[PDB]
Paper text:
In human cells, the NELF complex (comprising the four subunits NELFA, NELFB, NELFCD, and NELFE) inhibits RNA pol II elongation shortly after initiation to induce promoter-proximal pausing. We identified the RNA-binding subunit of the NELF complex NELFE as a substrate of p38-MK2-dependent phosphorylation after UV light. We show that MK2-dependent phosphorylation of cellular proteins triggers the recruitment of 14-3-3 dimers. Phosphorylation of the RNA-binding subunit NELFE on S115 by MK2 promotes its binding to 14-3-3 and dissociation of the NELF complex from chromatin that is accompanied by RNA pol II elongation in genes functioning in telomere maintenance, RNA metabolism, cell cycle, and DNA repair.
To investigate whether the binding between NELFE and 14-3-3 after UV light is direct, we synthesized a biotinylated phospho-peptide centered around serine 115 and performed pull downs with recombinant 14-3-3. We could observe binding of 14-3-3 to the phosphorylated peptide, whereas no binding was detected if the peptide was dephosphorylated before the pull down. Although the asymmetric unit of the crystal contained one 14-3-3 epsilon and one phosphorylated peptide (Yellow), 14-3-3 epsilon forms homo dimers with symmetry-related neighboring molecules in the crystal (Cyan). As reported for other 14-3-3-phospho-peptide complexes, the N-terminal four helices, αA, αB, αC, and αD, are essential and two salt bridges between Arg19 on one molecule and Glu92 on another are the driving force for the 14-3-3 dimer formation. In addition, Tyr85 sitting under the conserved lysine position on αD forms an accessorial hydrogen bond with Glu22, supporting homo dimer formation in the crystal. 14-3-3 epsilon has a peptide-binding groove, composed of αC, αE, αG, and αI that catches the phosphorylated peptide. Especially the conserved triad of Arg57, Arg130, and Tyr131 produces a positively charged patch, directly interacting with the phosphate group of the phosphorylated peptide. In addition, a few hydrogen bonds and salt bridges between the main chain of the phosphorylated peptide and 14-3-3 epsilon contribute to the complex formation and adjust its relative orientation.
Numbering used by the authors:
A (entry chain A), B (entry chain A): 3 to 232
C (entry chain P), D (entry chain P): 3 to 6
Write the structure that this text describes.
Amino acid sequence: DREDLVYQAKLAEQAERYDEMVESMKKVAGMDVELTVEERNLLSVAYKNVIGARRASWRIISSIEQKEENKGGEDKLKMIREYRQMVETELKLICCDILDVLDKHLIPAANTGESKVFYYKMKGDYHRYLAEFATGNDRKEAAENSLVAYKAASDIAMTELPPTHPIRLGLALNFSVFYYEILNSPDRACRLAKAAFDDAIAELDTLSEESYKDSTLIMQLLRDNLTLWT
Amino acid sequence: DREDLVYQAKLAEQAERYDEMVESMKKVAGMDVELTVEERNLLSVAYKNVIGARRASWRIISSIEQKEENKGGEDKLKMIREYRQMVETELKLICCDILDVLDKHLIPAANTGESKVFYYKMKGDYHRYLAEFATGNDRKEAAENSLVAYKAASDIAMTELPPTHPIRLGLALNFSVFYYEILNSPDRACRLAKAAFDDAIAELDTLSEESYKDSTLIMQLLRDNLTLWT
Amino acid sequence: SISR
Amino acid sequence: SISR
């Protein structure tokens, strides 16, 4: 039945029906077991597409708000705002859902370094998405939580994954993105990104057969952001 | 408030959130007025994206059913089938929703030839989608209903729209697709498609400034299907 | 077969 | 800024 949930997850993925792919993988996370690499990727992809869609809508709607803000079209702005807010509510719910699954099931039942780094990194990511559109104190809370999860993923990763491991690199990438876009700290964003790249270049022999394209790509992305930021 | 519903429809469209674009435009159809060309296109695009998604999922899932059918993998097939059937249920509901809005509001309140041809053509299309995946008697019913709506759109179109009008051409296109894919009648599909093309070529001066690219395209599509079918 |  |  675990094997069926995974199969249904795959069916849902091919059909591009991500809500159900989330439902399938939630159930598998609810079994309080260590998930396979496959099942971690399925969960991740399920939740990324579902959140991805709203994040895309939120930006489109913000852009239009900003347009109507500069033209002073106040009648439309009421509608734009109500609509942004509805989407923010979806984003909150989706993020709270996975954050909960992480705290109550995935993180507790994790037993390898790879999965622990993955889950705390995920938790950092999802708090960071809450923070992308939050204001004031809510923004603060998501920032503190996101920092705390990214530090926890970092502590375990630093001691337990080669610097080439794509999860470690992915962690560096996003944690440096966090510092730049959320803490508004280009100096730390760049020191972190530069170091993670450099550490993987110093040990390129440690690249796995399984994940060299993933790693390569992540390092390309590290490079692209350093450019962007300088 | 009619103007607001249309604006919300547009916001939803840009955000790629089609469910709400349908909700907005349903309300506008519920006002028992002749819709503007804009509002007909918004309704159409709203319902096409919502149905489009399930039609795409249904094919993907069928393809995989067919694969598992030839390998004799019967354990998976249970899951594939349950999943196809769930999607069929969505398709039925979405089609019944718009078919209802058409019969109870749009068609009754239509007062120009353009809108009458549009709405009966729409009704033909949506019965045809029901028929795409229906079996047995249900397939028959959708076919009879779809034929009847396409004939009704044809009667009004023949007398009231130049042969170049994109709605008339779009009607011919889909009605010939109907004959080919649903009634399994390549001879009528081709006679219809050939005639609609030819009639527009005989009167190319009748092409509107508003819709020549649309018409052009439709005629290209008529051409592409005649090829496919011969 | 392609529809509009 | 691009994330993974």
